[PDB]
Amino acid sequence: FGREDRFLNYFASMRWFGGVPLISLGKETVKQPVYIVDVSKGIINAIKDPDAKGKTFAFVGPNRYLLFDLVQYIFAVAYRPFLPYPLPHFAYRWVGRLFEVSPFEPWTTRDKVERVHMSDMTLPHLPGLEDLGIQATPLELKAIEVLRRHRTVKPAKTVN
Amino acid sequence: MWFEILPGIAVMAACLFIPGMATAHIHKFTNGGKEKRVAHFSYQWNLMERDRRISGVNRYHVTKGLENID
Amino acid sequence: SRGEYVVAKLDDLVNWARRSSLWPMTFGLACCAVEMMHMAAPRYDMDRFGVVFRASPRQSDVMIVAGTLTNKMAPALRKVYDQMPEPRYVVSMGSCANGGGYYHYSYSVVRGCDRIVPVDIYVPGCPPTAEALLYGILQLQRKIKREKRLRIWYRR
Amino acid sequence: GVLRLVMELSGEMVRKCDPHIGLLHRGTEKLIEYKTYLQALPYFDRLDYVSMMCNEQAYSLAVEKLLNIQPPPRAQWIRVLFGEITRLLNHIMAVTTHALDIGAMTPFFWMFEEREKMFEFYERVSGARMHAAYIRPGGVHQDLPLGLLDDIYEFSKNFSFRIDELEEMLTNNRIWRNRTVDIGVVTAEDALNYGFSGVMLRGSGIQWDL
Amino acid sequence: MNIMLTLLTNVTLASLLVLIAFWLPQLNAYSEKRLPFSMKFFLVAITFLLFDLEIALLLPLPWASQTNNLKTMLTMALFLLILLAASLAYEWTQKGLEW
Amino acid sequence: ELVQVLRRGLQQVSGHGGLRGYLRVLFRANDVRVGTLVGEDKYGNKYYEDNKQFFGRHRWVIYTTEMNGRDTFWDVDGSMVPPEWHRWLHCMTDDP
Amino acid sequence: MFMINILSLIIPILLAVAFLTLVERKVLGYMQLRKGPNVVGPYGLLQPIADALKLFTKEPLRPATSSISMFIIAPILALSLALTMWVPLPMPYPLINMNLGVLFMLAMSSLAVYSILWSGWASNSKYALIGALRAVAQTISYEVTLAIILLSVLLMNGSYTLSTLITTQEHIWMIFTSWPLAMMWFISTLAETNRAPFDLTAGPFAMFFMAEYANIIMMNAFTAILFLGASHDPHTPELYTINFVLKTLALTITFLWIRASYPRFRYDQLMHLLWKSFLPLTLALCMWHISLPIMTASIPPQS
Amino acid sequence: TYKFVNMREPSMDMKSVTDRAAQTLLWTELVRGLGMTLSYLFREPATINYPFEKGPLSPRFRGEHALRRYPSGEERCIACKLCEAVCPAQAITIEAEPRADGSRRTTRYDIDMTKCIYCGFCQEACPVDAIVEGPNFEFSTETHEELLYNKEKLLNNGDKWEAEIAANIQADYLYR
Ligand SMILES: CCCCCCCCCCCCCCCCC[C@@H](O)O[C@H](CO[C@H](O)CCCCCCCCCCCCCCC)COP(=O)(O)OCC[N+](C)(C)C
Ligand SMILES: CCCCCCCC/C=C\CCCCCCCC(=O)O[C@H](COC(=O)CCCCCCC/C=C/CCCCCCCC)COP(=O)(O)OCCN
Ligand code: SF4
Ligand code: SF4
Ligand code: SF4
């Protein structure tokens, strides 16, 4: 997630369709957002780090969130009224397919809706971002930076 | 020189020629080759309505001549 | 096929439209601006090329940096660049704007306007002559002519 | 040029006017301390880039006074001639830009044609249109080309008509008079105290010309 | 009917051409990145409103000239214009037209 | 009078090789003046002069349509002039 | 065939406006010892087309905080009013023959200020709001004297019908009967359209620009109809159309000339100009033109 | 001696007052300005047809830099570094060593076009006229890097412009 990131921006963009549709009201999906600067610094340090030749890293954020309250926080920062209505998984797929038609880059795709709904895995065995000497930045510090432009406090609860 | 301004001006003139002329031609084509009848004051409107009824083709422009007096 | 032909023709039309009317906003920072105003003078007549005289930033197409960029002025120039509609270009005029020039080793001078904004055309000289600036503007026109957006979108 | 101006207005009236400068501070005076005198000469072209050879002349006079030498008479006559040409250039710039800001905008072109001719004179004498660096602290760099005085005479016998056209456009116009008359009135004592010079003094009746 | 059709056509053409102008550059992808309350400006609007009312009163003059009572209508029209001039003069002398 | 200016216009049309050449020069150089041929360039540039024009317009160049490797029917520029004709064209000398 | 008539009225005005810009640049350039656009097209003839295409292909900068409703509505109103005010005009025959054509045009011109007000208030800026307020005040101020001068002139016509103006001026122009009113009317039309010396203030910007230029052309055409009467022969209206177009072109070129010839007023200076030089003279001449037909037994017929 | 610019007193007789009132009411000076502009329209413009026509120049004109060579074909530069010393903007960088035949020649001769002020001090400081500032001015560039000249670029410029450069030096060397 970042300033020119789709994920923070993608949720904010929907407000246009009035309501926000989340499969199972977003109650069965957990996410692990990571800051863009953190990933770039991790890549730089991995370039610098000599023993990270054949290793595999997992860059994750500090806090896990349910989809519903994450979208709620995104809409709260943007000062946009938030209405969430459950949508059938098959119904959601249909909308994505309709969207997929455009010559121009699509707002959403079937793979994207399915991908967003899925909860982020957890791989504690893989070396993480902290092994590269970087402290992951919480989304609460950069939410205002990303979402100030979407306008014209109460951080979301995390699960660990 | 200054006459190089004349082309664009000419275009404007042509663009300003089209509306008025067009109206006149349409007024000649819709009103049977004559000037469109103006109707203020509600008396000219009565004259037009009387003309429409007399012709029998439901058109004010068609004119019934003396030949229709028997 | 016809799919490439139609996008090629439309791309040519769009490029001709964009390069046949370039509306510049000019930062008259220093002495380079005086030659700028001589390119609008009757002898050279920038307006006869479709290049309008002193366009507003809200509807400008090309940014001409004419003069020294100090540290105190750089944020304002960056903001003005950020306030431009997307099909925008920057022309760096003169040696001070190109690389700091005759105040390169100064404590209060940006060593080239390209540290702040990307630059499309560099016009050399101190100041560059009116004809030299006209040559640069014409060159920018050819560069715009060479670009191709619909083709890239088609092959992508 | 480039100016930031912070002002407080009570309704239409300007209660206070504050200019913030330094947007073109390049540190010329500190850079001069790292050059020789000849190397430091071209900075004065850049100081007042509407009147170049006048700055050249001032710097050359200072260096000559410190050196206890004097230029040859022909150099001095050339200096005064090109200083008067520079004065014509600067006054054209000033008047036409004043009118342009107010809104006339036609004499700007009318007189920048003559300004282009005077840059042709500069280029013929020095090889540079506006930053010649011709006046050196020992005289001038090069002698005039053999056909320059004739062209200067030909130019200068036609300029009075251009000034007359400018006056036709400006001097008797009621809009221009209403824009300029009784605006920015300064008293002679205030002008002398505040450090004014040139026209800003002579507009208040002070009889002073260096 | 004809006036309604003409107004509808003008509005429709303006709306369509504004929409195409506003949507043609939105198909291609880009970066996609107080109090003072001056009092004289209110007096200008109020004076305009009052003079517009008096103009509304003056409007039936072209038909007023065929009444057979020409002396009375001339007297009343001149009276209305005199009071309009008097309103202007009163607002002038009370420093109501200053800046 | 007016007949004479029309005659000079017709002479300009006839002096460019007909209507085809007239349209060619009008759309390539935005000018239809005719002058004495001063010289021909080894790259295809033609140089004309007319001393009756005011200073600045008394010399001009008609560019070639194909220089070293590119099509130059439309994309002409001032860097295509060789140094000798560059000196002549910029009035740095009176001798071609 | 009323749709065809509407389209044949509405399209040539827009083309005329596009070409007017070329003429304005070209006329000004030759007045400044230079040329206008003469590279894009044989004589700059392709310059308006390139300008239109570039402006229509350039990104629109929506303020990201403004009321999109009024932001869209204002150009719609501007274009609609500008195109509507051409309907009443008779060249020689009007598209719509109104009894109160002049009054209808007055009402439309009165509406014209809502676009300025909405554009200023939707701009989401204090300074643009102040500028819009100044423009609206100037517009209402000068439309007052426009209305008074217009009724004073129509007192010799006998009605508000625009066609009757052709019958009134069959022998002599109206400029000779009352030139001072024509002078003040010309200045008031200059000040209404925010034209020099009164010019104190991608897609929607072009929309407003075409609206303003169409208003300029329409104002000049109305002035030519009102004060420079062309002789109309019923069996060949093309002569009247040619004369009317020539006079309108001359008046528009006169606006360009005045723009090229003068400096600009201050705001308070034009306020003082109107309220202390035009209004008293306008009222005095209105009294004079009321009393004049009665003194001379020269009252126009229609009632 | 001094003159008064605005020390006139308008006459107060009836004819003068009537003349001023006629000026105020009929806008006579505005018509005079209009007439000046109208007359000025009907005269030939001063615009030249660039790039097909070019502005006048002089043999002294300072343009793009070039390194010259002798008629035999050896370069005139002897690595004296006087141009580098005199350069007011420090735009010249020079490195030299003895050539394989023992000649005194440069191995590096760079001029930064973006630090150059085009003053011409370098060409007048040169003892052997190795470096000159030629007549070319139409060398605008799309990147900052191509405006950083090395010895090869300057030698190529000299070989490219030598004819015109030599002609200009022949025309102007008797003034130097
Ligand atoms: C009625 C329906 C309208 C729909 C929308 C379209 C709007 C109107 C379209 C008409 C626009 C006219 C375009 C004509 C431009 C060509 C100009 C020509 O002169 O350019 C030459 C050729 O250059 C380019 O190659 C021209 C390419 C232009 C496009 C070619 C065909 C495009 C037509 C497709 C239109 C279909 C629209 C479909 C969507 C509705 C070279 O000029 P240039 O180099 O600059 O200047 C050099 C300056 N010199 C000579 C002094 C040195
Ligand atoms: C015997 C029976 C006759 C009855 C009596 C009738 C006699 C009429 C005598 C008087 C008529 C003259 C009235 C004309 C309007 C005069 C208004 C006026 O003079 O106001 C000016 C203002 O005038 C202007 O400044 C306007 C200039 C705006 C620029 C426009 C350029 C002018 C040239 C354009 C050409 C005009 C074309 C007119 C005809 C148009 C045809 C449609 C005063 O301002 P200041 O001089 O600054 O002084 C005020 C401080 N005390
Ligand atoms: S680049 Fe040269 S001419 Fe331009 S402002 Fe700097 S010193 Fe002056
Ligand atoms: S012209 Fe002047 S600034 Fe440029 S390299 Fe030569 S000495 Fe240095
Ligand atoms: S002054 Fe001349 S010879 Fe000496 S180093 Fe410079 S270019 Fe070479």
From the CA of G120, how far away is ligand 2's center (Å)? 32
Expressed in Å, this structure's resolution amounts to 2.7
| Ligand closest to the CA atom of residue G264 | 2
As separate numbers, helices (DSSP H) first and strands (DSSP E) second, chain H gives 5, 5
**Residue nearest atom 4 of ligand 5, based on CA coordinates:** H80
Domain presence at residue E63: yes
Tokens matching residue E78: 């001149």
Tokens matching residue G260: 């090229």
Closest CA to G299 of H151, H119, E70, D53: E70
From the CA of H155, how far away is ligand 4's center (Å)? 17
- The answer to whether D98 touches D150, Cβ cutoff 8 Å, is no
- Which residue positions of C form the known binding site for [4Fe-4S] cluster? 31-32, 96, 126
Domain presence at residue E2: yes
- The answer to whether C67 touches C101, Cβ cutoff 8 Å, is no
- The answer to whether D83 touches C65, Cβ cutoff 8 Å, is no
Residues in CB range of G298: below 8 A, 6 or more apart? G292
Q: After which residues is chain F broken (C to N over 2.5 A)?
A: none
Of G153, G187, G199, best ligand 2 pocket probe by most atoms within 8 Å of the beta carbon = G187
What's the first-to-final CA gap in chain E, in angstroms?
48
Q: Tell me the nearest-neighbour CA distance from F3 into chain C, angstroms.
A: 29
Residues in CB range of E55: below 8 A, 6 or more apart? G144, G147, G148, G151
Contact status of F26 with chain G (Cβ, < 8 Å) = yes
CATH number of the domain residue H146 falls in: 3.30.70.3270
Strands (E), chain F: 36-40, 46-49, 59-62
- The answer to whether A156 touches A69, Cβ cutoff 8 Å, is yes
Alpha helices (runs of H) in D37-173, residue ranges in sequence order = 37-40, 42-47, 52-67, 73-102, 106-126, 148-156, 159-170
- The answer to whether C38 touches C26, Cβ cutoff 8 Å, is no
The amino acid sitting at D136 is R
Closest CA to D159 of D57, D85, D70: D85
Chain H residue with CA closest to G30: the answer is H41
Tokens matching residue D209: 């010309």
Between vectors from CA E24 to CA E22 and to CA E30, what angle results, nearest 5°? 95
Cα→Cα distances D155→C88, D80, F90, Å: 42, 17, 20
- Coil, helix or strand at residue D139: strand
Of H67, H68, H70, H82, best ligand 5 pocket probe by most atoms within 8 Å of the beta carbon = H82
Closest CA to A77 of A154, A130, A6: A154
Q: Tell me the nearest-neighbour CA distance from G237 into chain F, angstroms.
A: 30
The helix-helix angle for G203-227 and G113-122 (nearest 10°) equals: 160
- Coil, helix or strand at residue D205: coil
From the CA of H122, how far away is ligand 4's center (Å)? 5
Q: How far apart are CA A120 and CA G257, in angstroms?
A: 71
- The answer to whether D148 touches D121, Cβ cutoff 8 Å, is yes
Structural domain containing residue H123: 64-173
Domain presence at residue E13: yes
Q: How far apart are CA F77 and CA G63, in angstroms?
A: 41
Q: How far apart are CA D148 and CA D127, in angstroms?
A: 13
CATH number of the domain residue E37 falls in: 1.20.58.1610
From the CA of G46, how far away is ligand 1's center (Å)? 9
What total of structural domains would you count in chain E? 1
How many other CB atoms sit within 10 Å of the CB of residue B35?
14
CA atoms within 13 A on the CB side of G37: 27
Q: How far apart are CA F56 and CA F90, in angstroms?
A: 9
Which ligand 3 atom lies nearest to the CA of residue H118? 2
Q: How far apart are CA D51 and CA C4, in angstroms?
A: 57
Q: What is the DSSP string of A117-145?
A: HSPP---TTS-BGGGGT-PPPPHHHHHHH
Cα→Cα distances H86→D11, D125, G278, H80, H82, Å: 57, 22, 69, 12, 6
- The answer to whether F55 touches H56, Cβ cutoff 8 Å, is yes
Q: Nearest by CB to G8, which of B22, B35, B38?
A: B22
Domain presence at residue E10: yes
- Coil, helix or strand at residue H31: helix
Cα→Cα distances G120→D55, F58, G115, G282, H136, Å: 48, 52, 8, 31, 51
Tokens matching residue H114: 């973006």
- Coil, helix or strand at residue E73: helix
Tokens matching residue D15: 């209660």
From the CA of H117, how far away is ligand 3's center (Å)? 8
CA atoms within 13 A on the CB side of D208: 14
Structural domain containing residue E24: 1-94
Q: With a 6 A CB cut-off, is C31 part of the ligand 3 pocket?
A: yes
Q: What is the DSSP string of A53-114?
A: SS---B---S--EEHHHHHHHHHHHTT----EEEE-HHHHHHHHHHHTT-SSPPS--HHHHH
Length of chain F as a residue count = 96
- The answer to whether G97 touches B38, Cβ cutoff 8 Å, is yes
| Ligand closest to the CA atom of residue H68 | 5
Closest CA to G73 of D70, B28, E19: E19
As separate numbers, helices (DSSP H) first and strands (DSSP E) second, chain F gives 3, 3
What's the first-to-final CA gap in chain F, in angstroms?
36
Residues in CB range of G1: below 8 A, 6 or more apart? B26, B29, B30
CATH numbers and ranges of domains, chain C:
2-155 (3.40.50.12280)
The amino acid sitting at G29 is G
Q: Tell me the nearest-neighbour CA distance from A3 into chain E, angstroms.
A: 9
Tokens matching residue D151: 């062209």
Between vectors from CA G48 to CA G44 and to CA G51, what angle results, nearest 5°? 115
Residues in CB range of A40: below 8 A, 6 or more apart? none
- The answer to whether C27 touches C79, Cβ cutoff 8 Å, is no
Burial track H119-152 (b if 16+ CB lie within 10 A, e otherwise): bbbbbbbbeeebbbbbbbbbbbbeebeebbbebe
The secondary structure of chain G, three-state, reads CHHHHHHHHHHHHHHHHHHHHHHHHHHHHHHCCCCCCCCCCCCCCCHHHHHHHHHHCCCCCCCCCCCHHHHHHHHHHHHHHHHHCCCCCECCCECCCCCCHHHHHHHHHHHCHHHHHHHHHHCCCHHHHHHHHHHHHHHHHHHHHHHHHHHHHHCCCCCCCCCHHHHHCCCCCHHHHCHHHHHHHHHHHHHHCCCCCCCCCCHHHHHHHHHHHHHHHHHHHHHHHHHCCCCCCCCCHHHHHHHHHHHHHHHHHHHHHHHHHCCCCCHHHHHHHHHHHHHHHHHHHHHHHHHHHHHHCCCCCCC
Is H116 labeled as ligand-binding?
Answer: yes
The helix-helix angle for E2-23 and G2-31 (nearest 10°) equals: 50
Between vectors from CA F55 to CA F50 and to CA F60, what angle results, nearest 5°? 50
Could you say which DSSP state residue D184 is in? S
Residues in CB range of A120: below 8 A, 6 or more apart? A30, A31, A32, A60, A64
Domain presence at residue E99: no
Q: How far apart are CA G54 and CA C13, in angstroms?
A: 10
| Ligand closest to the CA atom of residue G277 | 2
Residues in chain G closer than 8 A to F30 (CB atoms): 38-39
Q: With a 6 A CB cut-off, is H22 part of the ligand 5 pocket?
A: no
Chain C residue with CA closest to F79: the answer is C135
User: Cα-atom radius of gyration of chain D, to the nearest Å?
Assistant: 20
Cα→Cα distances D51→D86, D92, D120, G199, Å: 6, 11, 15, 33
Binding-site residues on chain G for chain H (CB distance < 8 A)? 27, 29-31, 33-35, 183, 257-258, 260-262
Is H78 labeled as ligand-binding?
Answer: no
- Coil, helix or strand at residue C109: strand
The amino acid sitting at D21 is I
Q: How far apart are CA H176 and CA H172, in angstroms?
A: 7
Closest CA to G182 of G153, G156, G147: G153
Give the residues across from C65 on adjacent strands.
C27, C92
Q: Tell me the nearest-neighbour CA distance from G270 into chain D, angstroms.
A: 10
A:G CB pairs within 8 Å? 3
CA atoms within 13 A on the CB side of H158: 22
Q: Tell me the nearest-neighbour CA distance from F70 into chain G, angstroms.
A: 22
Following CA atoms H156, H158, C35, C48 in sequence, which dihedral angle do they give, to the nearest 10 degrees? -70
Q: With a 6 A CB cut-off, is G222 part of the ligand 2 pocket?
A: no
Q: How far apart are CA G267 and CA E98, in angstroms?
A: 12
Contact E66 G84 (CB under 8 A): no
Q: How far apart are CA D176 and CA D183, in angstroms?
A: 12
From the CA of D75, how far away is ligand 5's center (Å)? 29
Residues in chain H closer than 8 A to B2 (CB atoms): 41-42
CA atoms within 13 A on the CB side of G222: 26
Q: Which residue has the tokens 């009907």?
A: H42
Closest CA to F35 of F25, F43, F47: F47
Residues in CB range of C47: below 8 A, 6 or more apart? C40, C53, G25, G29, G34, G35, G36, G37
